[PDB]
């Protein structure tokens, strides 16, 4: 059961990393808009 729980743990980590990644994408597009 610890293996199945660990798969949930890593999936949740991957999901939170994706939200952080999308925030960095937002910032890059905003920086590009102000520079050009």
């Amino acid at each position: 059961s610890g293996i199945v729980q660990q798969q949930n743990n890593l999936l949740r980590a991957i999901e939170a990393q994706q939200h952080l990644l999308q925030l960095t994408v937002w910032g890059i597009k905003q920086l590009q808009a102000r520079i050009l």
């Binding site: 610890g2 293996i3 743990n9 980590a13 939170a16 990393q17 910032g27 905003q30």
Partner: protein, 34 residues
């Protein structure tokens, strides 16, 4: 941008919690199953 920094902060702390819990569970699985 101020809101962006606050969201960066909230997600960084959330991710560290999820990683820590994954580390603890990995050590538990290694001891309980190996």
């Amino acid at each position: 941008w101020a809101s962006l920094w606050n969201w960066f902060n909230n997600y960084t702390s959330l991710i560290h919690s999820l990683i820590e819990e994954s580390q603890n569970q990995q050590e538990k699985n290694e001891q309980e199953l190996l």
